[PDB]
Scaffold this active site. Structure first.
Site, PDB file in Angstrom:
ATOM      1  N   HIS A  34       0.836  -1.273   0.086  1.00 41.35           N
ATOM      2  CA  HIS A  34       0.032  -0.002  -0.017  1.00 41.35           C
ATOM      3  C   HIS A  34       0.927   1.221  -0.176  1.00 41.35           C
ATOM      4  CE1 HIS A  34      -3.512   2.353   1.906  1.00 41.35           C
ATOM      5  NE2 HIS A  34      -3.680   2.097   0.583  1.00 41.35           N
ATOM      6  N   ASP A  64      -5.857   1.763  -3.338  1.00 36.52           N
ATOM      7  CA  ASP A  64      -6.628   1.714  -2.248  1.00 36.52           C
ATOM      8  C   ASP A  64      -7.665   0.372  -2.192  1.00 36.52           C
ATOM      9  OD1 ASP A  64      -6.067   3.589  -0.323  1.00 36.52           O
ATOM     10  OD2 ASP A  64      -7.326   5.100  -0.830  1.00 36.52           O
TER      11      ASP A  64
END
Ligand SMILES: CCCCCCCCOC[C@H](COP(=O)(O)OCCN)OP(=O)(O)CCCCCCC
Ligand SMILES: CCCCCCCCOC[C@H](COP(=O)(O)OCCN)OP(=O)(O)CCCCCCC
Ligand SMILES: [Ca+2]
Ligand SMILES: [Ca+2]
Lengths: 134, 134
Positions: A34, A64
């Site tokens: 991420h 995301d």
């Protein structure tokens, strides 16, 4: 803040090397990737004609979404559940992506708009979007 | 959300009895007592002429201060550090207490006002206040 048992879940990371993972290696892996998102905008940064007014990093929607799936598939279910609920449900963040100009919505899950309407006749532009609930 | 390893740290509690504590028994103890504060106002509740517009519980300053000291004195330092930083520094909550009408401030630590000025000639009234940084 970084969630104890992880090196990458929270603001930045506290890893000593690019390949270090914490105790909760599955949850942390999801955060590591991420954090390594190719397209992000730091707090107060301006990008793609948008500007992040949050005190935390905001990334592209692609990253995301991948993060969401990662967490839902993580073997470290208790810590992933906590990190998942916090990030997608409680901090009220947003992601950006290239999309046709938005026109409307149909609160595909109240509080947030998952099936917005776009004008398909106008070229795509970067805009801010809501996340799915975890 | 409840912080894994505790039964009381987060929205409400997930304890099975009034006396149950989690893995992090020192940190959790601090939250248990916090939750058992004699004077609190639930999300959206109205009390003492004030109304809590937060989506979480807000308590009296006395309870919030005791919570602060509890955490700083907790043997479970890693989880207390996390819970302490989150609650006092990142969620931007407030506490209420009976005090002379406030007039000013001297940002005793920017972002928040710890040495506000009061008018000592007017009877005490319930008001909202900032917390110390953890
Ligand atoms: C109460 C308010 C606190 C909110 C904390 C904000 C976290 C920022 O999420 C962004 C980063 C990604 O951005 P950076 O870490 O800044 O990105 C790396 C780019 N250098 O996501 P992550 O994958 O590290 C998110 C984890 C949140 C979990 C909650 C546990 C505390
Ligand atoms: C990103 C936004 C999420 C914020 C969560 C809000 C927590 C509410 O704190 C109030 C309660 C006290 O109120 P209640 O639990 O509602 O009170 C009991 C009264 N029935 O405090 P605690 O002692 O349980 C606080 C712990 C926060 C730690 C963070 C780890 C997730
Ligand atoms: Ca991070
Ligand atoms: Ca609680």
């Amino acid at each position: 803040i970084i969630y104890p048992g992880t090196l990458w879940c929270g603001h930045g990371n506290k890893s000593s090397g690019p390949n270090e993972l914490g105790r909760f290696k599955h949850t942390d892996a999801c955060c590591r990737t991420h954090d390594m998102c190719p397209d992000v905008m730091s707090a107060g940064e301006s990008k793609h004609g948008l500007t992040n007014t949050a005190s935390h990093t905001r990334l592209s929607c692609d990253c995301d979404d991948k993060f969401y799936d990662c967490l839902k598939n993580s073997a470290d279910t208790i810590s992933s559940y906590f990190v998942g609920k916090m990030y997608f449900n409680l901090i009220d963040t947003k992601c950006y992506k290239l999309e046709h100009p938005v026109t409307g919505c149909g609160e595909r899950t109240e509080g947030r708009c998952l099936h917005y309407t776009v004008d398909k006749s106008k070229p795509k532009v970067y805009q801010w979007f809501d996340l799915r609930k975890y």
